[PDB]
Design a protein around this ligand. Structure first.
Ligand SMILES: [Cl-]
Ligand SMILES: [Mg+2]
Lengths: 241, 231, 250, 195, 240, 243, 244, 111, 235
């Protein structure tokens, strides 16, 4: 079965290399989560630093793609950085060609089209990553758009990705059943970050220190990541609740 | 076994079999020896004939006035690599008015061989080379292998039964290293070294090949009646 | 590096089948049901918006796409393959037609171009076939209303009405019973909604159903006034509300 | 090069072409045949830039001969003329164009009619009862406008040609060393040996 | 571009793709060439599982390369068109630059060279075609007949046959052709050519084609009636 | 199966076995290390003395990139050279366009993306080296380690080769016993010790030590080799500690 | 590298055959039968559609018969998609010839070039052959009315009457039996349909499962007309020969 | 506009005896009315008992001599240290010069 | 399958070794080098009596001072000869002199290993290149598809070669006259040939400094064959 080694159809109409690329997605054993506020979009991901010899500051799976767009990756870091560099280049070229900042959903589509090609063309393998793009779009407002190795993409009210993704997903589903709305009805991003961390704690059943987490925030006209000290402030605020 | 189909494949233990098979062609090749003092560097090569009617395959090729090599394995591959080396020595002269450092010659051969070990459709070079040269930092001897690995030595030997000559040189180190300002004595030590690798045969006039380069001696080749002096 | 796969990945087996086209069709079989019905004064194309998670926003995923102002497409099979085909189909309508003749291509010819792209993925070096079947509904001045199906092989056929994917065999039977040559557009929409309810299992409403028409011109959708011979697109995606309106009187 | 004429009569096409080849102040040759047989019932005369003329003629000849062998069939004069026009029309927008003017005289065996085509270096084709290239036309066109009749015999056409050559020998500045005359009819191509 | 080495050596030193190309030639309809004292005759079998043919328009098996040289073949028909086209182009190019038509040896050597080239070029298979090439050199009356094959080896023949059951007709020609005295006339040479085909063919009905080539571009196709006369006369003599 | 015969093929568990086999070639190589210090980095490597005939000091393995970056690697030596040649092209290009010498994190991704690119196609083989590299830029000192998969991170200390585990353990002690920092001259000595300690895993042949370093104070931010008095001083420190 | 996955589409079998050509012909043998019959005063093209569904739009459809130029048409047996690629090539090639020579392309020349393109796919490039067999029906002023067939090997031959696709063995014997040289177009029409009627894998022949075309001299004096029959016209010709 | 040529002056002279030959040239190098060098040799021993001078535009002359010296070097490599005859050197230099027929070496050459 | 440029575990290129087998199947070719000239002889081996044997061209001129005989897949030799002629003529154009025989041979041998995934396979033919030059006198070279060439005093290649080579080992001495060498080639050919040697199924040639490379007519070889039988009958 050489139909299992390259991206051609199997007799049941399946692409095993694409399916096996989805399995590489969880190789890092990290879970990510994204939600939308009124003004903002927050993305949180677990930060696991096993080796003591590592420089913890260099260990990251969140990327600043453009001034406005941020991206968290679920998958091995080489493929992750490969996708990050490409997305940065694509976002820059878009601005140069068309005279405005590339929207989150359009970058998502473009990267999804790129992933689709690897599923159809044989010489290119799929990247073993899932890319969650976040921004506050100037037309669409707070935005989450996610890409996978199949070349599939869609916008989300909120989303999660990783080994224990389903727990987090249903946790969020249940909140939006109750809340009755499309987003976190909150003024400040600080409290939306607090929501994100809180519901991650419930769904995973685990506690986090400042160095166990990684947080990206998108507001109007900038996406930025939080330092450990900014996260510690956030954890403290949750504990005093 | 299942992983020796081409050079682009690693074995499960991390080996490159096509490179190792290329290395094997060197082992079947006729023996050749390299050694050097502080003033001169010598190549001695045992040449191989097809039969009694045939000539003896040349093993030594001149690269520049101050550099040259001996070969063991696929001869056309040595011709390719020696030609590349001639060009590199030449580029250094024409552009920089600079004799090519023997060490840089090593690096350039290493990088040329390596590209054939990482790409599909190609093949590793099937020859090993011994490069001697006298440059701005004295006498030098280099051992090239088609894996890409190049090594600087006081002396060595490659080819079939090269182990005899290599142990002799390993013993004789402290003596031959100080044969300074005497060409004929360093050559004798080289001929004696190659003799440890002979079996059911000894050195004849059209069988033996010597080359020397050093302080005030351009790289030159001795064959025929000009080697009788050393048998 | 470089694409060293310059040879065909689809080849004839001893029996004469082209395996990858057959397997592509099998991928289409697994896909969600979609259909099209051709009325006298319009065409309807419809499908189910089968969401992946309720946290997804299924409005951001458009299964029915505008190709030209008078041509729309829907599919069954692999979504990402469909997405790039729509991208390529839009561009080819311009490069190989509009930029030459100053007008949009007629349905059959655009369909013809899409089929060409799909045929080439069945023979060119180093690619697999597209894993989709398309239904393309459209209008043009000299041919009127039309509906075409395009398969992974690159073959296309004109249809009065048909369905593709999951429950196509059943849906095609239900359409044979109901279709006649005197159908008005509203009647075809009604039949489309009935035919589709058969194949949908979960919720059946304006948020789970995607449905567009090729009908009358829409000056209100043109974007400008002042050129009376320009009357606007015949392609219109029915709103979530518009669909629910017709399910009360189902 | 310089003088090439063509007259189409009732049953044949007659081509007349000057024999001189001049370079500088020297007539290098006075017996030059400025013509190539493309097929058994099609002849092409040529005039223009040195080198280009023969190079172009022989190139066309090779192509028409190749066609003849491939299909075992002779192209009509109309078809050959169209092929030749297209090559010149290509050439005029090349890096270095063929600066060659031609006349194609042929007998179409399907129609049983003679045909004369005048094509200049730009690729301008016209079918004519009589034609000429270069300065020759400035005398011969008006002369033929007067004397020519559509139903003339080959023999009458040759006399009409003598008139043309006589006038050119009287009023043209250069000595073109007479002409070689060739007739194209239902029986193919032949050369008038004394003119 | 498609690069694959399809024609390659096997452990026994054989190039199977060249040898399998020969199997395709063996399956082809028979072709024979015989050179007389003053002519060369090309004869070709046409397989008779095909009625409702239109012979006006169906490709004839003997092809004119130039007006003085002809080429026939056995093997894949579509392949033969490619060789025939190239040869025709080369024939015109030779006339253009040398100002002289090709010799039969030259034209043969060219076609043989094309065939050889397809046996050691990446991405292509060998031609499944062997050719008989016949004619007269310009301003020469000595007849010429050459054979080519997929490998690219070529040589001259007093008479030769290729294709299916060629061994049978080669056997015939070998005992019926005297080197010392070749078929003195056209009549004689055509007869020997038909006789050899009749060892293999069937009836000499819509089954045998004959083409005669004389010096100075004198090449004509014989038709049913005149061939039938040869078939008729040969059989009535044979009843002894 | 056969998932491990071609590079860039995902196995059903989601792995690229060819990259994993390249790691085996790395693990087979000699030990090399890197230690990040207060204002710099130190690199060291074990050079096996195959024979008396190897000219001492004359088969240099640590490589400089630009003027401020040091690279050392364990595994297939020519593969490491190919990677450094590429690094040199990348640094030259960056310098040419942006004027400033290439930042170390920027340089790390350039190698990372290039190595990762050799896991994307079956027409290339993955790199048979793990590379320890780093230097000093406008933001301070950086040490990186990069693997055949293209994966890399920043390190306080790093090791690879046959003695990787012995050296890792020894590096963890330094990190634990010096939270405030380790000085450049200190790190040169420790580096020597750790190589001598990691030589237990490779001990038929005796070896030649080779150290290099970039320090803002001690080398002006440039990459220099350690030889003469300072090398022997560090060799002696190591000799002491094994007895 | 990639050599692993190469099918080697352009090699010989040990018997000296082209696998991919053989298997393409096997593909073609399951396609709707197409028949061409040539008369003294015209040509008939008749072909059977692959089992139609009642909901297929029958009049706006073309699956079997295609117009190459005003004087030449083809009947297709095999993959439709493959055939359209070759048809556009043939349509362009006809226009190049007209542009070059100011004369409509001779039927054989067009046929040879399409056949040459097919041949190329069997000898070089490592791609699969086109799974298509054509019947060419056309007129030119050299040979008059002509029929040709080409197949994936790139081999072409001329015919008085011929079939391609399914049941050619049966169809060829029936044509061989009832064809005479002095035949007229209307007799040829009748033969074409009666042959399909007996060879079809259906219950009986109906208008909706047929495509039909003629090339007569039926217009105004010494000039040629192509008639691609509409559904209603086939329905009538089916009654007018007594098959329905 | 940029003029790629210059004139560096000087003059050269070659005479042949029965068993010898001389090639002489002055050592002055100039541009316009200035002296660049009073000693800049332009007659060179090229090996194999061939002497050569390429007088006119010095940059072109140095390039040509450099190329011919290189031609001798490779003649030895490729033809078993064979001696390059003066007649063979002459023909080799013809191809060196004519290879730049449409952008010439601005020199009068003597060997 | 497995790549064209692959090494065996013994350290040899499969494709080059397999081409050597094809060469063993070829017809016999013999060369002998003397101080008076070099002789080249071949077995024509017509595959049928109807084939006109003088059309079998297996000895070939490269330049006036260099000749060549072949054995193996002889169609593969065309382009090697074409290259050789171009190289020899080109050398004369660049240097106004005759190309050295060794240099010519080296140039041909460079083509040999330019194959892979350039041409698709090695050549399936070996060549005996014979000639004269001022520096090294009369020379004979055996050029293989491995890219290796050996100088020989005498050499045989093709099917009859191991038997013929052993015979040449005895018979060659440094003072052979040209005539003696001509007879030796004829003698050894008649020994190893299947069919009976005559002027039609074998061919002779030589290259002398004075007259250059000459293929012998069938009349001239016929007399040498007749002379050979008489010298063997007489002891
Ligand atoms: Cl895109
Ligand atoms: Mg792929």
């Amino acid at each position: 079965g050489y139909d299992r080694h390259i991206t051609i159809f199997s007799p049941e109409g399946r692409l095993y290399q694409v399916e096996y690329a989805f399995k590489a997605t969880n190789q890092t054993n990290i879970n990510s989560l994204a939600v939308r506020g009124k003004d903002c979009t927050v993305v949180i991901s677990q930060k696991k630093v096993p080796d003591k010899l590592l420089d913890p500051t260099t260990v990251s799976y969140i990327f600043c793609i453009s001034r406005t767009i941020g991206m968290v990756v679920n998958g091995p870091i080489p493929d992750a950085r490969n996708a990050a560099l490409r997305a940065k280049a694509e976002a820059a070229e878009f601005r140069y060609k068309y005279g405005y900042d590339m929207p989150c959903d359009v970058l998502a589509k473009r990267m999804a089209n790129l992933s689709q090609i690897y599923t159809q063309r044989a010489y290119m393998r799929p990247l073993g990553v899932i890319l969650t793009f976040v921004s506050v779009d100037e037309e669409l407002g707070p935005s989450i758009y996610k890409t996978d190795p199949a070349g599939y993409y869609v916008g989300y009210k909120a989303t999660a990705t990783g080994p224990k993704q389903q727990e987090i997903t249903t946790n969020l589903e249940n909140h939006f059943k109750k809340s009755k709305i499309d987003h976190i009805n909150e003024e400040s991003w600080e409290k939306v970050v607090e929501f994100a961390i809180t519901h991650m704690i419930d769904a995973l059943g685990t506690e986090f220190s400042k160095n166990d987490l990684e947080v990206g925030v998108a507001t109007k006209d900038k996406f930025f990541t939080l330092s450990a000290e900014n996260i510690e402030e956030r954890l403290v605020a949750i504990a005093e609740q | 076994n299942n992983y020796d189909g081409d050079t682009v494949t690693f074995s499960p233990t991390g080996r490159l079999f096509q490179v190792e098979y290329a290395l094997e062609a060197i082992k079947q090749g006729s023996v050749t020896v390299g050694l050097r003092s502080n003033t001169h560097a010598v190549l001695v090569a045992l040449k191989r004939n097809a039969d009694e009617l045939s000539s003896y395959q040349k093993k030594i090729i001149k690269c520049d006035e101050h550099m040259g090599l001996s070969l063991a394995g696929l001869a056309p591959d040595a011709r390719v690599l020696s030609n590349y080396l001639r060009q590199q020595c030449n580029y250094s002269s024409l552009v920089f008015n600079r004799k090519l450092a023997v060490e840089r010659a090593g690096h350039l051969l290493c990088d040329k061989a390596q590209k054939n070990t990482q790409s599909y459709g190609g093949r590793p070079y099937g020859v090993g080379l011994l490069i001697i040269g006298y440059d701005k930092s004295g006498a030098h001897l280099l051992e090239f292998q088609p894996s890409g690995n190049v090594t600087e030595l006081y002396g060595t030997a490659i080819g079939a039964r090269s182990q005899g000559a290599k142990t002799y040189l390993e013993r004789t180190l402290d003596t031959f290293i100080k044969i300074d300002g005497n060409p004929d004595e360093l050559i004798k030590a080289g001929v004696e070294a190659i003799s440890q690798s002979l079996r059911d045969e000894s050195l004849t006039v059209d069988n033996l090949s010597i080359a020397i380069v050093g302080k005030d001696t351009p790289f030159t080749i001795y064959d025929g009646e000009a080697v009788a002096k050393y048998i | 590096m470089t694409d060293r796969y310059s040879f065909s990945l689809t080849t004839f087996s001893p029996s004469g089948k082209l395996g990858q086209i057959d397997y592509a069709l099998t991928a289409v079989k697994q896909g969600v049901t979609s259909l099209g019905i051709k009325a006298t004064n319009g065409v309807v194309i419809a499908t189910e918006k089968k969401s992946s998670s309720p946290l997804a926003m299924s409005e951001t995923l458009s299964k029915v796409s505008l190709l030209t102002p008078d041509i729309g497409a829907v599919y069954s099979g692999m979504g990402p393959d469909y997405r790039v085909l729509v991208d390529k189909s839009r561009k080819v309508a311009h490069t190989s037609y509009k930029r030459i003749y100053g007008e949009y291509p007629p349905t059959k010819l655009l369909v013809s171009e899409v089929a060409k792209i799909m045929q080439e993925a069945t023979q060119s070096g180093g690619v697999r076939p597209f894993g989709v079947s398309l239904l393309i509904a459209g209008h043009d001045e000299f041919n009127g209303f039309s509906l075409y199906q395009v398969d992974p092989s690159g073959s296309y056929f004109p249809w009065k009405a048909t369905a593709i994917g999951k429950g196509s065999v059943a849906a095609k039977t239900f359409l044979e019973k109901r279709w006649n040559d005197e159908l008005e557009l509203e009647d075809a929409i009604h039949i489309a909604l009935l035919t589709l309810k058969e194949s949908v299992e979960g919720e059946f409403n304006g948020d789970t159903i995607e449905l567009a028409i090729i009908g009358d011109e829409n000056p209100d959708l043109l974007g400008y006034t002042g050129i009376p011979t320009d009357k606007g697109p015949r392609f219109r995606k029915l709103t979530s509300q518009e669909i629910n309106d017709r399910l009360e009187a189902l | 090069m310089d003088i090439i004429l063509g007259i189409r009569v009732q049953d044949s096409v007659i081509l007349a072409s000057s024999k001189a080849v001049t370079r500088g102040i020297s007539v290098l040759k006075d017996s030059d045949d400025k013509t190539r047989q493309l097929s058994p019932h099609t002849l092409m005369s040529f005039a223009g830039e040195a080198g280009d003329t023969v190079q172009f003629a022989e190139y066309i000849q090779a192509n028409i001969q190749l066609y003849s062998i491939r299909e075992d069939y002779e192209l009509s004069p109309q078809a050959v003329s169209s092929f030749v026009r297209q090559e010149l029309a290509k050439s005029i927008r090349s890096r270095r164009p063929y600066q060659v003017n031609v006349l194609i005289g042929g007998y179409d065996k399907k129609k049983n009619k003679p045909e004369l085509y005048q094509i200049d270096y730009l690729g301008t084709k016209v079918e004519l009862p009589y034609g000429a290239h270069g300065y020759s036309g400035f005398y011969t066109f008006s002369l033929l406008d007067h004397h020519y009749r559509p139903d003339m015999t080959t023999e009458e056409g040759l006399d009409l040609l003598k008139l043309c050559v006589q006038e050119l020998e009287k009023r043209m500045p250069m000595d073109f060393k007479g002409v070689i005359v060739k007739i194209v009819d239902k029986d193919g191509i032949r050369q008038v040996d004394d003119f | 571009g498609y690069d694959r080495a399809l024609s390659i050596f096997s452990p026994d030193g054989h190039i199977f793709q060249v040898e399998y190309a020969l199997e395709a030639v063996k399956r082809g309809t028979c072709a024979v060439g015989v050179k007389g004292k003053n002519c060369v005759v090309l004869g070709c079998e046409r397989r008779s599982t095909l009625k409702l043919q239109d012979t006006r328009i169906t490709p004839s098996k003997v092809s004119k390369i130039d007006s003085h040289v002809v080429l026939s073949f056995s093997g894949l028909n579509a392949d033969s068109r490619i060789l025939i086209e190239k040869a025709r182009v080369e024939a015109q190019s030779h006339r253009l630059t040398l100002e002289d038509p090709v010799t039969v040896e030259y034209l043969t050597r060219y076609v043989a060279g094309v065939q050889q080239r397809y046996t050691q070029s990446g991405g292509v298979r060998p031609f499944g075609v062997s050719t008989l090439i016949a004619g007269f050199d310009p301003r020469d009356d000595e007849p010429k007949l050459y054979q080519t094959e997929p490998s690219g080896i070529y040589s001259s023949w007093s008479a030769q046959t290729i294709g299916r059951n060629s061994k049978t007709v080669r056997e015939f020609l070998e005992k019926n052709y005297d080197r010392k005295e070749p078929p003195a006339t056209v009549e004689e040479c055509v007869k020997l050519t038909v006789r050899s085909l009749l060892e293999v063919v069937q009836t000499g009905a819509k089954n045998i084609e004959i083409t005669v080539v004389k010096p100075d571009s004198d090449i004509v196709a014989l038709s049913s009636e005149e061939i039938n006369q040869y078939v008729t006369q040969i059989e009535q003599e044979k009843q002894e | 199966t056969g998932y491990d015969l071609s590079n860039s093929v995902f196995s059903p568990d989601g792995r690229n076995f060819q990259v994993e086999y390249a790691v085996k070639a790395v693990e087979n190589g000699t030990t090399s290390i890197g230690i990040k210090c207060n204002d710099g980095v130190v690199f060291a490597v074990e050079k096996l003395i195959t024979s008396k005939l190897l000219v001492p000091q004359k088969n240099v393995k640590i490589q400089v990139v630009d003027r401020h970056i040091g690279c050392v690697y364990s595994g297939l030596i020519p593969d490491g050279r190919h990677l450094v040649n590429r690094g040199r092209e990348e640094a030259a290009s960056f310098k040419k366009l942006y004027k400033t010498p290439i930042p170390i994190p920027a340089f790390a991704d350039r190698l990372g993306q290039y190595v990762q690119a050799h896991t994307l196609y079956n027409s290339v083989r993955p790199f048979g080296v793990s590379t320890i590299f780093g230097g000093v830029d406008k933001n301070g000192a950086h040490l990186y380690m990069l693997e055949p998969s293209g994966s890399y991170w920043g390190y306080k200390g790093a090791a690879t080769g046959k003695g990787r585990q012995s050296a890792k353990a020894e590096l963890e002690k330094l990190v634990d016993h010096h939270p405030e920092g380790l000085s450049a001259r200190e790190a040169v000595k420790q580096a020597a010790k750790i190589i001598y300690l990691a030589h237990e895993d490779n001990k038929e042949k005796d070896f030649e030590l080779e150290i290099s370093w970039c320090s803002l104070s001690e080398t002006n931010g440039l990459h220099k080799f350690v030889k003469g008095d300072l090398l022997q001083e560090a060799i002696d420190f190591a000799q002491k500690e094994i007895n | 590298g990639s050599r692993r996955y190469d099918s080697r589409t352009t090699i010989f079998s040990p018997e000296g055959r082209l696998y991919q050509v053989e298997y393409a012909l096997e593909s073609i043998s399951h396609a709707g039968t197409a028949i061409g019959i040539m008369a003294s005063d015209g040509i008939v093209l008749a072909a059977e559609r692959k089992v139609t569904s009642t909901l297929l739009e029958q009049d706006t459809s073309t699956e079997k018969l295609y117009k190459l130029n005003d004087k030449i048409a083809v009947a297709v047996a095999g993959l439709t998609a493959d055939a359209e690629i070759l048809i556009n090539t043939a349509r362009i090639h006809a226009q190049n010839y007209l542009k070059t020579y100011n004369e409509d392309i001779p039927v054989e020349i067009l046929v040879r070039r399409l056949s040459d393109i097919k041949q190329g796919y069997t000898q070089h490039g490592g791609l699969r052959p086109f799974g298509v067999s054509f019947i060419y029906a056309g007129y030119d002023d050299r040979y008059g009315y002509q029929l040709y067939t080409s197949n994936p090997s790139g081999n072409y031959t001329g015919w008085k009457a011929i079939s391609v696709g399914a049941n050619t063995s049966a169809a060829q014997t029936l044509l061989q039996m009832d064809y005479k040289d002095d035949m007229k177009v209307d007799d040829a029409i009748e033969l074409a349909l009666k042959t399909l009627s007996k060879t079809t894998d259906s219950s009986a022949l109906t208008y909706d499962r047929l495509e039909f075309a003629t090339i007569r001299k039926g217009a105004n004096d010494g000039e040629v007309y192509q008639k691609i029959f509409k559904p209603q016209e086939i329905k009538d010709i089916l009654v007018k020969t007594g098959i329905t | 506009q940029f003029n790629p040529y210059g004139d560096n002056g000087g003059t050269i002279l070659g005479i042949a005896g029965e068993d010898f030959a001389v090639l002489a040239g002055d050592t002055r190098n100039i541009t316009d009315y200035s002296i660049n060098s009073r000693y800049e040799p332009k007659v060179f021993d090229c090996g194999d008992n061939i002497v050569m001078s390429a007088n006119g535009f010095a940059a072109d002359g140095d390039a040509l001599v450099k190329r011919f010296k290189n031609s001798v070097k490779w003649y030895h490599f490729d033809h078993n240290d064979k001696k390059l005859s003066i007649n063979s050197a002459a023909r080799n230099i013809q191809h060196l010069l004519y290879g730049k027929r449409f952008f010439p070496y601005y020199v009068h050459t003597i060997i | 399958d497995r790549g064209v440029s692959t090494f065996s575990p013994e350290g040899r290129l499969f494709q080059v070794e397999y081409s050597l087998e094809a060469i063993k199947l070829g017809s016999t070719a013999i060369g002998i080098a003397t101080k008076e000239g070099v002789v080249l002889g071949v077995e024509k081996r017509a595959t049928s009596p109807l084939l006109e044997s003088d059309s079998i061209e297996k000895i070939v001129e490269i330049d006036r001072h260099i000749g060549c005989a072949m054995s193996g897949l002889t169609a593969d030799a065309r382009s090697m000869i074409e290259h050789a002629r171009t190289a020899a003529v080109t050398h004369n154009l660049y240097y106004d002199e005759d190309i050295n025989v060794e240099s010519l041979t080296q140039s041909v041998c460079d083509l040999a290993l330019r194959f892979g995934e350039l041409m698709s396979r090695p050549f399936g033919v070996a060549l005996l290149i014979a000639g004269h030059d001022a520096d090294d006198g009369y020379q004979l070279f055996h050029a293989e598809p491995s890219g290796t060439f050996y100088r020989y005093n005498a050499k045989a290649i093709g099917s009859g070669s191991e038997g013929a080579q052993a015979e040449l080992l005895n018979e060659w001495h440094s003072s052979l006259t040209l005539k003696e060498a001509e007879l030796l080639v004829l003698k050894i050919l008649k020994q190893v040939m299947e069919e009976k040697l005559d002027e039609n199924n074998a061919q002779l040639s030589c290259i002398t400094k004075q007259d250059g490379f000459k293929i012998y007519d069938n009349e001239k070889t016929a007399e040498l064959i007749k002379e050979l039988k008489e010298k063997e009958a007489a002891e």
